[PDB]
């Protein structure tokens, strides 16, 4: 590149546009980012440079054994638009810098892609979309090295987007939020939050600016500074919302209080608690073989409106893409299972001969429904990480269950074989093998049913030997006395292993996993906070029992910012200014590092040595001449 | 004491060394030019 | 036939077959111990 610098810096020689374009094409084809930077920086008009034939040639320069070439020929001029649309999805798939950036991302030219990003216009959305695209392509790379390179470049682009938004937000919160919530035309009119959700950029959600924006959207039209007690007080007595307790602007006031996501969340929590109370009241008292009463019909209508709401938020959650995204959430699976169990229980009950089966199904369905209340504490800032840490402990739980099952089988079968009770019915065998040793882990040790010194000695059994009568109801009629000391020793070893070793080991594993995964679980909570807020943003303002009204309107009719062209161009210019400032600061910080100082010092010492040698030779020549 | 401890850090030593090498380069260039001029004059 | 010997010859398939056989062996052992084991000839 030094030769190019020397040639192009000459003032006597000027270079016409033809040579510049030829050299630019050569450098773009041959992957020389420094040359393309030099040529473009020397007054080159890139807009007139690019032609459809030039882009076709650039895409034809793809390697023969490359994923981009494979997909381009599978789609069949380069019809890369179809390739993009089949990669990302119709929701978020796509100075011609955007085209060059897309080409470099497709061909995995890391420095070319970074340089094009540094010269782009919509920098934050381009970084998020590039991270999404690189992750998607890494999902399709057969070579592990290609997948690793794509994931590394995706992480680099995510870091660039996070840093740029951090720079922008510290300038003005209003314009940064406007940039974050706008729709980018290049990436299918998807907002930066949608792209960050699609790309699983959890580090983008975890920063302070995005979290503050999410908190602002969570409180709706009232001030985020509003405390919880004031909100609850205003909720319970609606006419009190008009006083100075709640600060707004951040009949109209009524719709601004009852339309906030947090108010809808609280209304749904209250309605769910009342639904559980009604369910328990019906289950414990009202449920009778007689035809359903008023409370049963009210419960059925409540469950019907719950099902309608689940259907609505599954449809509104590509139809197949929306269905997959709705089913991908565990809290929605917990709703679907509960509703299916409710339907099965009611259907069984309505049959005259299946009343008890229906009641049992509904009794289990009550547990299924009540488990859903755990979603309430995913909104807390302190206990939000805890619930997502807890979900990581299932490996330890299942390890403990497997070890416990093996040990219970061994100990129970050995003890049952030693005792030889005469009531050897299969349910009794299973009970004395599994249920009793399991209860011995929780302080329920039936010594009178196992230790022969505590029993009565009688010759009930006709078989030869000695036998004793345990007073237990399901402990067998009589047991053998041959090796009772071994039964006692087996009990001692069981208490030593199960009550101490396994439980202490499980505690150790829980502590280890907690300390290992707390850091990632915090970020996961911060990422899923957006899904929570966007779920409650579009919900109807009514509670489920009355929500059939809102759904009716939604049947009667069968996160966005609108910007004019001038406002959009001003926002993009501001973003580009901040990107240039950030890049210059990063480059300056790199240049002032100790390694760079040492390198420059070494180069200057070499230059001094060359000058010293030249002076030495010239002094020798002068001395020779003057003598 | 704090200022002295900061001045004796490796980063400051490297910075001062770079500045002194630049000064040496300037003096070497001056001596080069003066030697060329002296050789021209004496010939 | 080659596909048959390629499925039943894999190490993981042999591992699963041995796991199933060991579980059945333990079940038979427990059945013999708790019920069948009597002073009469086996
Ligand atoms: Ca739901």
From Swiss-Prot, chain C:
The chain holds residues 769 to 810 of 1214 of the full protein. Signal peptide: none annotated. Belongs to the transient receptor (TC 1.A.4) family. LTrpC subfamily. TRPM4 sub-subfamily. Calcium-activated selective cation channel that mediates membrane depolarization. While it is activated by increase in intracellular Ca(2+), it is impermeable to it. Mediates transport of monovalent cations (Na(+) > K(+) > Cs(+) > Li(+)), leading to depolarize the membrane. It thereby plays a central role in cadiomyocytes, neurons from entorhinal cortex, dorsal root and vomeronasal neurons, endocrine pancreas cells, kidney epithelial cells, cochlea hair cells etc. The chain crosses the membrane at residues 15-35. Homotetramer. It comes from Homo sapiens (Human). TRPM4, is a temperature-sensitive ion channel, it adopts distinct conformations at different temperatures, markedly influencing where and how ligands interact with it. Decavanadate (a positive modulator), ATP (an inhibitor) and Ca(2+) bind to different locations of TRPM4 at physiological temperatures or at lower temperatures. This is Transient receptor potential cation channel subfamily M member 4. It is linked to Progressive familial heart block 1B: A cardiac bundle branch disorder characterized by progressive alteration of cardiac conduction through the His-Purkinje system, with a pattern of a right bundle-branch block and/or left anterior hemiblock occurring individually or together. It leads to complete atrio-ventricular block causing syncope and sudden death. Phosphorylation by PKC leads to increase the sensitivity to Ca(2+). Sumoylated. Desumoylated by SENP1. Widely expressed with a high expression in intestine and prostate. In brain, it is both expressed in whole cerebral arteries and isolated vascular smooth muscle cells. Prominently expressed in Purkinje fibers. Expressed at higher levels in T-helper 2 (Th2) cells as compared to T-helper 1 (Th1) cells. Expressed in keratocytes. Residues 36-42 are extracellular.
């Amino acid at each position: 590149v030094d030769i190019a610098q020397s040639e192009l810096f000459r003032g006597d020689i000027q270079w016409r546009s033809f040579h510049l374009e030829a050299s630019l094409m050569d450098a773009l084809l041959n992957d020389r980012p420094e040359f393309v930077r030099l040529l473009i920086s020397h007054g080159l008009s890139l807009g007139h440079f690019l032609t459809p034939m030039r882009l076709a040639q650039l895409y034809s320069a793809a390697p023969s054994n490359s994923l981009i070439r494979n997909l381009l020929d599978q789609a069949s001029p380069p019809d890369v638009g179809h390739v993009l649309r089949m990669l990302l999805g119709k929701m978020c798939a796509p100075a011609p810098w955007s085209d060059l950036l897309l080409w470099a991302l497709l061909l995995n030219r890391a420095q070319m892609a970074m340089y094009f990003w540094e010269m782009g216009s919509n920098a934050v959305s381009s970084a998020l979309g590039a991270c999404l695209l690189l992750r998607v392509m890494a999902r399709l790379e057969p070579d592990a090295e290609e997948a690793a390179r794509r994931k590394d470049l995706a992480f680099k682009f995510e870091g660039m987007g996070v840093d740029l938004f951090g720079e922008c937000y510290r300038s003005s919160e209003v314009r940064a939020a406007r940039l974050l919530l706008r729709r980018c035309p290049l990436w299918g009119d998807a907002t930066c939050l949608q792209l960050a959700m699609q790309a699983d950029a959890r580090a983008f959600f975890a920063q302070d600016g995005v979290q503050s924006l999410l908190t602002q959207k969570w409180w709706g039209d009232m001030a985020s500074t509003t405390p919880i007690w004031a909100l609850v007080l205003a909720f319970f007595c609606p006419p009190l919302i008009y006083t100075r307790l709640i600060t707004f602007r951040k009949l109209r006031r009524w719709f601004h209080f009852w339309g906030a996501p947090v108010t809808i969340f609280m209304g749904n929590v209250v309605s769910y608690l009342l639904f559980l109370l009604l369910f328990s009241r019906v289950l414990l008292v009202d449920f009778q073989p007689a035809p359903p009463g008023s409370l049963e019909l009210l419960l059925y209508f409540w469950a019907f409106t719950l099902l309608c709401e689940e259907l609505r938020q599954g449809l509104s959650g590509s139809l197949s893409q929306r269905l997959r995204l709705y089913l991908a959430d565990s809290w929605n699976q917990c709703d679907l299972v509960a509703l299916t169990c409710f339907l099965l229980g009611v259907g069984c009950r309505l049959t005259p001969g299946l009343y008890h089966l229906g009641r049992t199904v509904l009794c289990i369905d009550f547990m299924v429904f009540t488990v859903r209340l755990l979603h309430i504490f995913t909104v807390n800032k302190q206990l939000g990480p805890k619930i997502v840490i807890v979900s990581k402990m299932m490996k330890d739980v299942f390890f403990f269950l497997f070890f416990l099952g093996v040990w219970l089988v061994a100990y129970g079968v050995a003890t049952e074989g030693l005792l030889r009770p005469r009531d050897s019915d299969f349910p009794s065998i299973l009970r004395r093998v599994f249920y009793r040793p399991y209860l011995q882990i929780f302080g329920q040790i039936p010594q009178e049913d196992m230790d022969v010194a505590l029993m009565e000695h009688s010759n009930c059994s006709s078989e030869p030997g000695f036998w004793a009568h345990p007073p237990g109801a399901q402990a067998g009629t009589c047991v053998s006395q041959y090796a009772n000391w071994l039964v006692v020793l087996l009990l001692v070893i069981f208490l030593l292993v199960a009550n101490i070793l396994l439980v202490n080991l499980l505690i150790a594993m829980f502590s280890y996993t907690f300390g290992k995964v707390q850091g990632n679980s915090d970020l996961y909570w911060k990422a899923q906070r957006y899904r929570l807020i966007r779920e409650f943003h579009s919900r109807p303002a009514l509670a489920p029992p009355f929500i059939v009204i809102s759904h009716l309107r939604l049947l009667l009719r069968q996160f966005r910012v609108y910007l004019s062209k001038e406002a959009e161009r001003k926002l993009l210019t501001w973003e580009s200014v901040h990107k240039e400032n950030f890049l210059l600061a990063r480059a300056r910080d790199k240049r002032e590092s100790d390694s760079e100082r040492l390198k420059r010092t070494s180069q200057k010492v070499d230059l001094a040595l060359k000058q010293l040698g030249h002076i030495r030779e010239y002094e020798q020549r002068l001395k020779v001449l003057e003598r």
